[PDB]
């Protein structure tokens, strides 16, 4: 099939009609209530309550020869 | 007063269909993969 | 996210909508010197509004926005 | 630049020479003098540089 | 190493070279080899021109920078009045 | 000298009606605008913003005498197209100095270079050529308001005469019809825009114009409104004729309808001397002070037309599939870039201005001419593609379609990368000169606040990008349709050339075939020059950015 | 005022119609004259013998212009046999 | 303070004029003979949807300018907003209503945020040499500057961090700070 | 279109053109001069005293205009 003869394979239509499927299934994707909650908490929340989190707590720590009396917390 | 295979909008939907890019219904294609049962 | 919105809300869909724009800002295309001399005359006629009335340049760029808006639909 | 410089100053000596009013022509004097002053400063500022450098210099 | 003669020299070697092959006729027969030394002869010849094109422009840029300052300081030396 | 070799060239071409002599007439066109050049290059001796000539009706700088040579020197390569065969026979036994300068071939030459091609059979039409010149230099060095309308018409009269002057074509007289019909439209409104100026003005002298500018721009009874909206009218005709959006519908149907050669003229001589024109009183009337005046400026019509152009060329682009109409758009994309360059009126801009118009010239004219000579190769090659059978004017335009230029890469690798270096010049791709040219505009942009329009020429680049690297994948990434002509070379089809020497005595007798038929050595040098220019500018550039730097400040030397 | 109304009349051309290509060359001379005709009248109200200078390079102008378009429309017409755009 | 439905009053009547100028060519290429009332009849709801957006655009940037107090960048974003709004109620379509008021926000945003010069940029009036010299040679700045922006910590820990960290925990956390020595000896 | 473009053009007619169209009127006064009637030139008279000298490249701009024309129109109608 190739430029370079290969071995032969048993090419199961079944499984070469699966990784077409996946292939091309991008051009089937819609907007609809799933869709657009699935892409707005992976794409917005997650990573906006991430953001928040770095956000707030950076500086918060220094680890850095820290001894007894003396705490972790920098801010 | 040009031909219509030079400027006619009917060459550019031969050259480009609509149909080459798949718009769906969740009544035939819910799954979003193409139809693939 | 991969074979879905991140792929409609990007290059796919940008290819999808701009053949779409590509083709109705070429159906205008008519080759008739008549229906041309028509677009020279409204094209002179906006650039002399938009200069004599002292217009919001905002008021142009919505205009423009709107054109595409109005493109993009087809019939 | 914001001063204009014409590029045909002669336009100063346009003008029908046939039925003028006597007192019609304002006085140029003041504009003839001050060509003559930017031809002299241009042909001294060359008189000075040949005669300074490439000359007396080399 | 940007060296006018020898980049323009260069430059019509390269001409002769991408003509042949675009007419697609070998790139050196034997009948044909006085052309790369004219080729790149009339390369060599522009860039020599180059040069004193070059030469021109240096002193002239060169020129007209005296002339900014000088147009800087005349305005600043005014304003300290 | 321009205007004795056109009464020289009419006069002699006036007593004959042998079609056999226009390839000589067009020869001799080269050979007079290289005197053309050489008495321009005599003048270059002196700086100056300007010195007014002929009773102050025409006037001449630095800047208007490098541009009368470029505007030369592109029509001397122009005029290669219709002053040298399309093919040769080229053979090892003939190739020595000693061969081309003392012995002579023979052979049936008129089917092989076709001689008899209607490209090479109108006497005419050099003589029409170096009419369109004339107006072009004419409106570089125009000083008046009556000389603007004489030097237009006389560059637009002539353009509409070349696109119809193939008279049995009906794609070309339609095209002329077109370009006539809109084109003197486009002419009333710059008549109109100069006689708005004359009857509130008093003057036909652009220094007088200038003059009332400068003065009303400080900071009653006459406040002069009309310098800008006459301007603005008279602005308007020009934007037609560099077909920048909105006003550039006519362009991909006359360019396409044409034949490709009389293209390559008519879509780069008259962008270039209204540009200039353009650029001159863009600086004159360019008001200083933040007043009344400048919230009308006329050149917001530039920056408008320059987001227009940027917008419609690259996208309406995306969809065509007939060549010329995609270089139609995708120079209605480049004036976009050019008209960013004029509009913001800095030094920054100037030298962006001078150099863009200079690059995009020449990379232009390789596009054409690498189309050109693509046509002139499949001579020697057939196909049985359907599509192609039923094209018109196949012989004034061979290539007319993106599809014919599929698995070109297979039929010549070589000039199929020139025609990719040249398309990935327009991109903007480092290291090419498009590159540099297209980051001189941008940073000149940006550092005089053009922000949101340095953003829209990336956004609409990106998109542009699309339908150029479209036509580099049919070259590439498929095999082609078109086959070498089997009765070419079937190992008995050989015909005859004889080598003769001084005194036409027989020296040899040689048998040969299509594979020693070859583009003719004029236009694959002058691609060749040209690719290598664009590929190699990043050792070169120089010479060529100090000659704008220098411009620009005489230009702007307060 | 009236050299105005000419010009809008040959505007108006443009507009009305769709499918009379002759109309298209008829306006242009329609506009070319109230143009002239406006320098005319300006240039006897400033005193200026240039505005008739002017007036005379345009209609000698205007003139070789209607010759080159009519002598286009004639090719044109050899060709197709008809001036009318189908519409 | 300004008056939000005069405003928008103005802001639908100029580009409603152009959908009436746009509306008019519709119909004068219209093929079929229609008449010279079919400006408002086949083509009205063109000449309607501009008369909307640039009705929705201008009261609410005003409308935005009221409720923030302020005049920047921010209003015309917003103004977009509902301008891009109100285009893609005309489609029927959701992700039309919100593409097209992303679009139009964004775009409407950045050329107030930048200033486009499509009616001309500001003018500095000021020796421009000076400050591109100013901004080229800037090499060295106080450090209170920096610390402005950047602030203190995040391993920028200028002289003298030690003495106000304890001073920042004990307004804190009420605890003295007081590490202890690691020599036996002490 | 009338409305728009009558409306900015109008704005654009000095007064010499609009000062008498469209109960106090302005009348124009005239009276004679003697030394400017020494030699009156008719108005043609007077194009002429100007257009081959002083304004001459126009001339020959036109000259260039018309040869372009008799030479373009011929070569595209008739038979070789
Ligand atoms: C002034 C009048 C006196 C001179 C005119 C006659 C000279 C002899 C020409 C000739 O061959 O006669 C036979 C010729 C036909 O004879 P033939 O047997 O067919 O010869 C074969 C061909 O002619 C093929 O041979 P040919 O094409 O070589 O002959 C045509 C002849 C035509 O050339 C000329 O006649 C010269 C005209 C001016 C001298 O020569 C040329 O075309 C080559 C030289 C072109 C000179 C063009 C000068 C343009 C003016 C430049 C002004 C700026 C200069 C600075 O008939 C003509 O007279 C042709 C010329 C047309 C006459 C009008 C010329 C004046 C026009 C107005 C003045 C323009 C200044
Ligand atoms: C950026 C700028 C960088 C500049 C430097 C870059 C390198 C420059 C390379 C250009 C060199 C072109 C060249 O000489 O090719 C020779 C070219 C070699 O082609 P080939 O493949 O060996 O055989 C030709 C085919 O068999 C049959 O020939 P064909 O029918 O296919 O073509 C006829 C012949 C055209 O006939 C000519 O040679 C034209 C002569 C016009 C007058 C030039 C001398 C002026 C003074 C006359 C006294 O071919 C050409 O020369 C085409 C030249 C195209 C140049 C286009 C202009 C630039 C683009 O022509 C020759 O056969 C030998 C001619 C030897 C003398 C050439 C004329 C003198 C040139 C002097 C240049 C300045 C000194
Ligand atoms: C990748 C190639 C690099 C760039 C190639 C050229 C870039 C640099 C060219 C700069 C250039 C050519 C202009 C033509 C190019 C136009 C556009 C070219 C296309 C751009 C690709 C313009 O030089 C002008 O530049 C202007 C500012 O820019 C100055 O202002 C002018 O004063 C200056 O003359 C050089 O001009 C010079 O040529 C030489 C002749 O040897 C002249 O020397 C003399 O000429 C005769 C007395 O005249 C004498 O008889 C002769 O004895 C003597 O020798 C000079 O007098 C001068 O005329
Ligand atoms: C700034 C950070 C990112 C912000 C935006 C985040 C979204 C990401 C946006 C990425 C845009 C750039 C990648 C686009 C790639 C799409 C290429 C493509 O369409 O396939 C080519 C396809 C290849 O796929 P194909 O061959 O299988 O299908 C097409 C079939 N033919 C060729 C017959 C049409 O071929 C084409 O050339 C067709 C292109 C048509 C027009 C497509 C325009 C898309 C580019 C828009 C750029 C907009 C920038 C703004
Ligand atoms: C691209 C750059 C083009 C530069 C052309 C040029 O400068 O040539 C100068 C030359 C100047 O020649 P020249 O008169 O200075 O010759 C040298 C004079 N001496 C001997 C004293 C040094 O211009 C020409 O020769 C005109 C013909 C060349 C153009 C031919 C087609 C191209
Ligand atoms: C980039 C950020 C967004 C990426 C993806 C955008 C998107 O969602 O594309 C979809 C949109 C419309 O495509 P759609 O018509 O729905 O599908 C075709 C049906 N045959 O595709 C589109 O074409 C939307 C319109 C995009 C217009 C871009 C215009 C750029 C120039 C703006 C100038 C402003 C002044
Ligand atoms: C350009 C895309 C915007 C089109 C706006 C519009 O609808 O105006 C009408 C006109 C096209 O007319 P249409 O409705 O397509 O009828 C054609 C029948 N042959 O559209 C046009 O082509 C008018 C051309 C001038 C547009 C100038 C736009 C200036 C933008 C600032
Ligand atoms: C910043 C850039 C904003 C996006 C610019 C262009 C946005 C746009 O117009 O996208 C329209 C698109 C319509 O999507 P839809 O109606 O579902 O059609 C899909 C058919 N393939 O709508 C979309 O795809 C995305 C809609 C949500 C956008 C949120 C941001």
């Not at chain 4, 004097?29 to 003559?36: A, P, T």
């Not at chain 6, 030369?72 to 300068?101: A, G, M, N």
């Not at chain 6, 006497?123 to 010149?133: A, C, G, K, S, T």
């Not at chain 6, 070109?408 to 010049?425: E, K, M």
Request: glycine content about 8%.
């Amino acid at each position: 099939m190739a430029g370079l003869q290969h071995y032969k394979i048993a090419m199961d239509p079944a499984l070469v009609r699966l990784g077409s499927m996946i292939s091309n299934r991008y051009k089937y994707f819609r907007w609809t209530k799933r869709t657009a909650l699935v892409s707005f908490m992976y794409v917005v929340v997650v990573p906006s309550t991430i953001g928040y989190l770095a956000y707030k707590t950076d500086g918060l720590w220094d680890l850095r020869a820290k001894r007894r009396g003396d705490l972790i917390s920098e801010r | 007063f040009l031909p219509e295979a030079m400027v006619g909008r009917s060459k550019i939907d031969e050259k480009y269909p609509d149909s080459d890019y798949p718009t769906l219904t969740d009544k035939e294609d819910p799954d979003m993969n193409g139809g693939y049962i | 996210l991969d074979k879905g919105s991140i792929e409609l809300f990007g290059p796919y869909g940008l290819e999808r909508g701009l053949v779409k724009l590509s083709k109705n800002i070429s159906s205008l295309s008519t080759s008739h010197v008549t229906t041309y001399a028509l677009y020279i005359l409204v094209g002179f006629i906006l650039y002399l509004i938009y200069n004599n009335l002292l217009l919001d340049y905002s008021y142009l760029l919505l205009i423009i926005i709107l054109l595409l808006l109005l493109m993009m639909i087809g019939e | 630049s914001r001063h204009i410089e014409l590029k045909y100053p002669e336009v100063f000596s346009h003008g029908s020479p046939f039925n003028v009013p006597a007192g019609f022509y304002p006085n140029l004097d003041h504009v003839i003098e001050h060509y003559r002053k930017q031809h002299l400063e241009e042909e001294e500022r060359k008189a000075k540089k040949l005669a300074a450098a490439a000359a007396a210099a080399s | 190493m940007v060296n006018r003669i020898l980049f323009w020299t260069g430059f019509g070697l390269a001409v002769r070279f991408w003509q042949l092959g675009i007419e697609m006729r070998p790139f050196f027969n034997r009948k044909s080899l006085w052309a790369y030394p004219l080729f790149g002869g009339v390369g060599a010849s522009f860039g020599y021109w180059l040069q004193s094109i070059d030469e021109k422009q240096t002193k002239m840029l060169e020129e007209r920078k005296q002339a900014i300052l000088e147009k800087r300081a005349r305005r600043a030396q005014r304003q300290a009045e | 000298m321009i205007m004795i070799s056109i009464l020289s060239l009419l006069l002699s071409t006036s007593v004959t009606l042998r079609r056999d002599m226009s390839i000589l007439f067009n020869r001799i066109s080269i050979i007079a605008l290289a005197y053309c050049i050489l008495h321009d290059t005599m003048s270059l001796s002196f700086i100056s913003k300007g010195i007014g000539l002929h009773g102050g009706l025409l006037h001449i700088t630095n800047l208007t005498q490098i541009f009368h040579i470029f505007i030369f020197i592109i029509s001397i390569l122009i005029l290669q197209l219709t002053s040298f065969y399309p093919r040769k026979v080229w053979i090892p036994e003939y190739s020595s100095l000693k061969d081309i300068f003392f012995n002579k071939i023979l052979y049936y030459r008129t089917k092989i270079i076709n001689k008899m091609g209607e490209h090479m059979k109108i006497i005419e039409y050099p003589l029409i050529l170096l009419f369109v010149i004339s107006g072009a230099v004419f409106l570089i060095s125009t000083n008046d308001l009556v000389s603007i309308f004489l030097s237009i018409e006389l560059q637009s009269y002539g353009l509409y005469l070349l696109s119809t002057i193939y008279r049995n074509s009906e794609l070309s007289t339609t095209g002329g019809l077109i370009y006539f019909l809109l084109g003197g439209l486009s002419s009333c409104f710059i008549l109109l825009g100069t006689s708005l100026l004359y009857v509130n003005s008093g003057t036909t002298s652009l220094d007088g114009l200038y003059i009332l500018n400068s003065i009303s721009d400080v900071n009653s009874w006459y406040k002069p409104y009309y310098l800008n909206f006459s301007l603005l009218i008279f602005s308007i005709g020009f934007l037609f004729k560099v077909s920048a959006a909105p006003f550039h519908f006519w362009s991909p149907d006359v360019y396409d309808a044409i034949p490709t050669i009389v293209t390559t003229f008519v879509a780069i001589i008259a962008k270039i001397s209204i540009f200039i024109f353009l650029l001159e009183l863009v600086y004159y009337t360019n008001s200083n002070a933040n007043s009344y005046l400048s919230e009308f400026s006329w050149t917001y019509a530039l920056l408008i037309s320059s987001l227009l152009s940027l917008i419609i060329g690259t996208v309406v682009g995306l969809t065509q599939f007939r060549i010329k109409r995609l270089l139609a758009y995708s120079t209605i994309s480049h004036v976009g870039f050019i008209l960013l360059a004029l509009s913001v009126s800095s030094i920054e801009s100037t030298q962006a201005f001078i150099f863009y118009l200079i690059q995009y010239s020449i990379s232009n004219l390789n596009a054409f001419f690498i189309l050109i000579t693509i046509g002139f190769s499949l001579y020697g090659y057939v196909t049985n593609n359907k599509e192609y059978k039923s094209l018109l004017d196949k012989n004034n335009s061979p290539i007319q379609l993106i599809s014919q230029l599929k698995g070109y890469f297979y039929i010549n690798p070589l000039l199929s990368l020139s025609l990719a270096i040249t398309i990935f010049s327009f991109v903007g791709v480092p290291p090419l000169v498009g590159f540099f040219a297209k980051q001189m505009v941008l940073s000149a942009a940006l550092d005089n606040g053009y922000i949101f329009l340095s953003l829209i020429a990336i956004i609409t680049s990106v998109i542009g990008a699309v339908y150029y690297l479209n036509v580099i994948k049919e070259i590439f990434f498929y095999s082609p349709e078109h086959e070498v002509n089997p009765v070419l070379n079937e190992s008995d089809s050989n015909f005859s050339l004889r080598i003769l020497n001084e005194k036409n005595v027989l020296i040899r007798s040689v048998l040969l075939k299509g594979r020693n038929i070859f583009i003719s050595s004029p236009f694959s040098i002058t691609i060749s020059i040209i690719t290598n220019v664009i590929l190699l500018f990043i050792f070169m550039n120089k010479e060529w950015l100090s000659m704008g730097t220098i411009l620009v400040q005489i230009l702007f030397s307060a | 005022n009236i050299t105005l109304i000419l010009f809008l009349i040959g505007i108006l051309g443009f507009v009305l119609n769709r499918k009379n290509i002759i109309l298209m060359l008829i306006s242009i001379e329609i506009m070319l004259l109230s143009i002239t005709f406006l320098i005319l009248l300006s240039s006897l109200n400033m005193d200026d013998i240039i505005g008739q200078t002017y007036a005379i390079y345009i209609i000698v102008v205007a003139g070789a212009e209607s010759a080159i378009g009519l002598g286009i429309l004639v090719a044109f017409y050899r060709l197709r046999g008809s001036i009318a755009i189908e519409y | 303070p300004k008056d939000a439905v005069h405003l928008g009053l103005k802001g639908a009547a100029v580009v409603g004029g152009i959908g009436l100028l746009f509306a008019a060519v519709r119909t004068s290429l219209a093929r079929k003979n229609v008449g010279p009332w079919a400006i408002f009849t086949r083509n009205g709801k063109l000449a309607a949807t501009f008369a909307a957006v640039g009705g929705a655009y201008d009261f609410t940037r005003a409308a935005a300018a009221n409720l923030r107090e302020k005049e920047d960048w921010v209003n015309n974003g917003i103004g977009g907003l509902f301008a891009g709004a109100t285009m893609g109620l005309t489609t029927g379509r959701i992700p039309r209503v919100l593409g097209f008021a992303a679009l139009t926000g964004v775009v409407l945003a950045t050329a107030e945020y930048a200033g486009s010069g499509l009616r001309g940029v500001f003018k500095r009036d000021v020796d421009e040499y000076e400050r591109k010299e100013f901004l080229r040679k800037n090499r060295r700045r106080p450090i209170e500057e920096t610390l402005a922006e950047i602030g203190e910590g995040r391993g920028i820990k200028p002289p003298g961090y030690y003495e106000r960290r304890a001073q920042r925990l004990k307004e804190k956390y009420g605890v003295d700070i007081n590490p202890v020595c690691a020599d036996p000896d002490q | 279109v009338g409305i728009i473009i009558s409306s900015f053009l109008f704005k654009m007619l000095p007064y010499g053109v609009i000062i008498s169209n469209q109960k106090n009127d302005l009348f124009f006064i005239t009276s004679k001069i003697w030394d400017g009637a020494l030699a009156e030139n008719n108005h043609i008279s007077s194009i002429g005293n100007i257009m081959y000298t002083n304004y001459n490249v126009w001339l020959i701009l036109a000259s260039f205009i018309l040869l372009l024309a008799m030479v373009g129109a011929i070569v595209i109608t008739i038979k070789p």
